[PDB]
Nucleic acid binder design. Structure first.
Ligand SMILES: [Zn+2]
Ligand SMILES: [Zn+2]
Lengths: 87, 87
DNA sequence: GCCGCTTGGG
DNA sequence: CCCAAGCGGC
């Protein structure tokens, strides 16, 4: 995927939020900025809590196309993403 | 539990049959005799392919009460175990 | 318990 | 890609 963002239910509880540095609980809704690695050739996620992600300021117009993983979210959460992005 | 035997769909494909020595395929029906390790507070399974389990002299009168995991098997496999035990 | 395979974080 | 945790086998 060449998308800039990723959203998903946390696969583990081990990722640390880049903003607040607190861990992100398994299964919770988390979002990443996908960035190029300096260790190897490929993208790595910078994970944030859902709310922390928005606090650091993004202009995502069409979440469905711009955020990888969007379509695999529960409808409930897809709507929370769209809603949040628009505001 | 405290039961001597366990039956389940194999959690991996890595276990080797203690009768025939061949690997037990992931998700296949497998059976174990359970033994207490003197090295740690935990039970160790000797796994077997379903068919091989009966060829080594392991024997079962009441699967329902003797074999841990029996009631969680698919109906088909419950009747297979019960039938094979009676035989 | 120990260890290797697999998964996940980076 | 490297490293470490989680899981599975024993
Ligand atoms: Zn955060
Ligand atoms: Zn066998």
């Amino acid at each position: 995927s060449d998308k800039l963002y990723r959203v998903e239910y946390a696969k583990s509880g081990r990722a640390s939020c880049k903003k607040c540095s607190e861990s992100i609980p398994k299964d919770s809704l988390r979002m990443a900025i996908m960035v190029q690695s300096p260790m190897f050739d490929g993208k790595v996620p910078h994970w944030y809590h859902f709310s922390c992600f928005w606090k650091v300021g993004h202009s995502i117009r069409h979440p469905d196309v711009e955020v990888d993983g969007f379509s695999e979210l529960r409808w409930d959460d897809q709507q929370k993403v769209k809603k949040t992005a628009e505001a």
